[PDB]
C-alpha cells in the first residue's frame, strides 16, 4: 500500500517530478529527471499539451500544491520514443534563475536491466491523481512479467511514474495498464543515449 | 620512467586521490580510496591539518587543478596507524550530493602481500609536487627491500604502490634521495589495522 513521501528532495526521490498541463481544467502526471535538461514521462502525458511544450510545467521534488521546493521548469521540446511504447522525453528550459533541471536535483540512475527478473521487488513513485495535488506517493510491488518493451508489476500508479529497483535505479516508466510500464530495454536505452548524452545507465 | 594519467576515472586509477590542505599556503599529497568512506595516506600528510580533519579536501580521480571529475570529499576523522609507520586512515564525510566516496569510485583492492617479493615490478601512482597541481602520474619501479612495515623500491607522499594485478601493496611516504624510495608495507599487522577500522576493506 501507498505511503506519502515528505522529504521529496532527499536520496533518490528528488528526481521524481510532478507534471502540470492546463487544458477547462488541467491534466497532471509524473516523470523523472534523467538529464541536464530532460525528464522521462508518457506519450499520453505530453500529448495533453497539444503540441505546445511550454504548456507543460515540471516540478521536480514537488511536495504539495503549495510547496515546490525546486520551483518549476517549462517544457521546451517533446521527443517521443519512435517505437510503439508510451514513452517520451521532455526537454525543459532553464528556470527564472538560469539553473538547469539536472542541476537543482540529481538526475536518476537508469538501470541497464541486465539483472531485472520477475518476482523482483520494486517501487513506483509519483503523483497519484486520487491524492491531493502534487503529493508524492511510493507503492511497493513485484515484477510479474517482462517482455520486449513491456514490464508488468503487481494499487495503481500515476502516468509517467518511474519504476525503481532495489538499487533505486529506474527500470521502467509506468504508463497504465496488473500495472504496465515501459521497460527500459536496449532499444529504449539507445533512444535515451541518442538524446540525453549525460544519461546515467548503471 | 613516469607518465601522466589522463583517464583518471577508468580502471584502477579512479581510487587514486588528490589531497589538498591549506596551511600562508597549502600542502598537497596523495591517497587511495579503500572503503565506503575511507582513504589511506601518510601520517605526515594528515598532520598538516593541525588536528582538524575538516581542513583536508580529498579529490578522487583528480585529473588537473581545474578538473575534479568526482568532486571533493571533506575529512571527518583521522585514524593514525598505532605502530611506528607513516600510515593513517582518513575517514571522509559524504559529499554535497550525500554520496559516499566508495560509491563514486571503486575502492582499491589491497594485496594480502603473500606473493610480494624483491625485484618484482610495481607502479607508484599519485600526484607529485614537481608536476602541475592535481595531475596524476604513474611511475614504474622495482622492489628492492621488504622488511617489517617497510617496502622500498627504485624508480609522492601517500601515493598507493600497485603490484601487477593493480592491488595496493604499500603506501609511499618518502625515502632517501639518490638511494631508495620508501613505502609503508601492508603486512599482516597493517592489514589487521585496516580490518579493525574499514568495515568493507577488500584484501585479496
Swiss-Prot record, chain A:
Cell compartment(s), UniProt: Secreted
The entry's keywords: Hydrolase, Protease, Secreted, Serine protease, Signal, Virulence, Zymogen
Main location: secreted
GO biological process: proteolysis
MF terms (GO), sorted A to Z: serine-type endopeptidase activity
Subunit (UniProt): Monomer.
Family: Belongs to the peptidase S1B family.
Name under which the protein is recorded: Glutamyl endopeptidase
Section covered of the full-length record: 73 to 282 of 282
Amino acid at each position: 500500500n501507498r505511503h506519502q513521501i515528505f522529504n521529496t528532495t532527499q536520496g533518490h526521490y528528488d528526481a521524481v517530478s510532478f507534471i502540470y498541463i492546463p487544458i477547462g481544467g488541467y491534466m497532471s502526471g509524473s516523470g523523472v529527471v534523467v538529464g541536464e535538461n530532460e525528464i522521462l514521462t508518457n506519450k499520453h502525458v505530453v500529448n495533453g499539451a497539444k503540441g505546445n511544450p511550454r504548456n507543460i510545467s515540471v516540478h521536480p521534488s514537488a511536495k504539495n500544491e503549495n510547496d515546490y521546493p525546486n520551483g518549476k521548469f517549462v517544457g521546451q521540446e517533446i521527443i517521443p520514443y519512435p517505437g510503439n511504447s508510451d514513452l517520451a522525453i521532455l526537454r525543459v528550459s532553464p528556470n527564472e534563475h538560469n539553473q538547469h533541471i539536472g542541476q537543482v536535483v540529481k538526475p536518476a540512475t537508469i538501470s541497464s536491466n541486465t539483472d531485472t527478473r520477475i518476482n523482483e521487488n520494486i517501487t513506483v513513485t509519483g503523483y497519484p491523481g486520487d491524492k491531493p495535488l502534487a503529493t508524492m506517493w511510493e507503492s511497493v510491488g513485484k515484477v510479474v512479467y517482462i517482455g520486449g518493451e513491456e514490464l508488468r508489476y503487481d494499487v495503481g500508479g500515476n502516468s509517467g511514474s518511474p519504476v525503481f529497483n532495489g538499487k533505486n535505479q529506474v527500470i521502467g516508466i509506468h504508463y497504465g495498464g496488473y500495472n504496465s510500464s515501459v521497460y527500459i530495454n536496449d532499444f529504449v536505452q539507445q533512444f535515451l543515449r541518442n538524446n540525453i548524452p549525460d544519461i546515467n545507465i548503471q
